[PDB]
Design an enzyme around this catalytic site. Structure first.
Site, short mmCIF file in Angstrom:
data_model
loop_
_atom_site.label_atom_id
_atom_site.label_comp_id
_atom_site.label_asym_id
_atom_site.label_seq_id
_atom_site.Cartn_x
_atom_site.Cartn_y
_atom_site.Cartn_z
N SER A 135 -1.03 18.89 -9.42
CA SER A 135 0.12 18.74 -10.30
C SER A 135 0.63 20.13 -10.75
O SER A 135 -0.17 21.04 -10.91
CB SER A 135 -0.27 17.86 -11.50
N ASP A 194 -9.51 0.67 -4.48
CA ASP A 194 -9.96 1.91 -5.12
C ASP A 194 -9.66 3.10 -4.21
O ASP A 194 -10.46 3.36 -3.30
CB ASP A 194 -11.44 1.81 -5.38
C1 LIG Z 1 -17.34 -2.48 -12.96
C2 LIG Z 1 -16.66 -1.18 -13.22
O1 LIG Z 1 -15.58 -1.43 -14.10
C3 LIG Z 1 -16.12 -0.45 -12.00
C4 LIG Z 1 -16.65 0.79 -11.65
C5 LIG Z 1 -16.05 1.58 -10.68
C6 LIG Z 1 -14.92 1.11 -10.06
N1 LIG Z 1 -14.14 2.03 -9.22
O2 LIG Z 1 -14.32 3.25 -9.36
O3 LIG Z 1 -13.20 1.56 -8.60
C7 LIG Z 1 -14.39 -0.13 -10.35
C8 LIG Z 1 -15.00 -0.91 -11.32
#
Ligand SMILES: C[C@H](O)c1ccc([N+](=O)[O-])cc1
Ligand code: NA
EC number: 3.4.23.22
Length: 330
Positions: free
Chosen positions: A199, A35
């Site tokens: 952008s 992430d």
């Molecule tokens: C469980 C939910 O889909 C989830 C929430 C938030 C994230 N994120 O911002 O990477 C991933 C997954």
């Protein structure tokens, strides 16, 4: 050093991508959601409330000869979608695609929110935003990338997400075979802890390009593309029967539609998101209303170049002294 790991969509919609990560000694392999919009490496664990675990693989620090409690440290994070998790912290050896970091903070969940529990395919998160957003208290911790950086051949990682297919995260090198043309680099602001960039504009389908600055973040842990209401209205106005539904929570469109592409600017370069990438399928099983992949950011406070946008490109997250982003077509 370098590392290279395959990332795999969790389901048929590309809702998220998981990448195998080795934690501890002997290795415990967990599938984490990398992430670039958060900065905690956190896992389902032997400490996670039992009723909140449903199918995830857990990290058990007591079975790792290299795990050590980071005494007194706790963590708590709340994500843009209202999901959250919290717990305590170990340090341990973490490897991604053959790249090893010793002493990485591995945040062990004691509690997760319902969305995490309900997603059996995601064993935790590996944050790749700037370490200033890391939630560990009282001593903030570094991301896997920040800890690896000095050892890497080049202080970079790249995201090459697939459309309905596996892709790759690479650390320490830029695979010149993985993209077409040249990489266009653009400035990054680290002021909010994100890979935040501007952008240069957009086009809808075969329409004229509109030159306009759109600040936003490159966020691999957000599924969709969230843009200003003006931009999003202009896109969905080109789809017969599309509308914004307060009941569903965004723009929907007839499943019978063929969607136009969406182009965004990176400096003088252009990345084209095919129309099919903007289809997120029926709103509920069997419905003929389909959920749009481009949504308004107006109720977020930030524009988000999520997976819909990023998987149309080869993306370079350049963590040199002056960070920058790069985008190439592929
Ligand atoms: C469980 C939910 O889909 C989830 C929430 C938030 C994230 N994120 O911002 O990477 C991933 C997954
Ligand atoms: Na959804």
């Amino acid at each position: 050093s370098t590392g290279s790991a395959t990332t795999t969509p969790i389901d048929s919609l590309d809702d998220a991508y998981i990448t195998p990560v080795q934690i501890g000694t002997p290795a415990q392999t967990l599938n984490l959601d990398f992430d670039t919009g958060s900065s905690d490496l956190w896992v389902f664990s032997s400490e996670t409330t039992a009723s909140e675990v449903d199918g995830q693989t857990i990290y058990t620090p007591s079975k790792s000869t290299t795990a050590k409690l980071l005494s007194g440290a706790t963590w708590s994070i709340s994500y843009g979608d209202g999901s959250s998790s919290s717990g305590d912290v170990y340090t341990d050896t973490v490897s991604v695609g053959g790249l090893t970091v010793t002493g990485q903070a591995v945040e062990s969940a004691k509690k997760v929110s319902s969305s995490f529990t309900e997603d059996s395919t995601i064993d935790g998160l590996l944050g790749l935003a700037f370490s200033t957003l890391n939630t560990v208290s009282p001593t903030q911790q570094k991301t896997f990338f920040d800890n690896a950086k000095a050892s890497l051949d080049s202080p970079v990682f790249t995201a090459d997400l697939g459309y309905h297919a596996p892709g790759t995260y690479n650390f320490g090198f830029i695979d010149t075979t993985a993209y077409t043309g040249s990489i266009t680099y653009t400035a990054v602001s680290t002021k909010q802890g994100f890979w935040e960039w501007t952008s240069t504009g957009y086009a809808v389908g075969s329409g004229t390009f509109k030159s306009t600055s759109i600040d936003g973040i490159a966020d691999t842990g957000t599924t969709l593309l969230y843009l200003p209401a003006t931009v999003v209205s202009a896109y969905w106005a080109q789809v017969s029967g599309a509308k914004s539904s307060s009941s569903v929570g965004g723009y929907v469109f007839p499943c019978s539609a063929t969607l136009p592409s969406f182009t965004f600017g990176v400096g003088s370069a252009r990345i084209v998101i095919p129309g099919d990438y903007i289809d997120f399928g029926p709103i509920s099983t069997g419905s003929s209303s389909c959920f749009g992949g481009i949504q308004s950011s107006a109720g977020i406070g930030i524009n988000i170049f999520g997976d819909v946008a990023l998987k149309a490109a080869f993306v370079v997250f350049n963590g040199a002294t002056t960070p920058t982003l790069g985008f190439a077509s592929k």
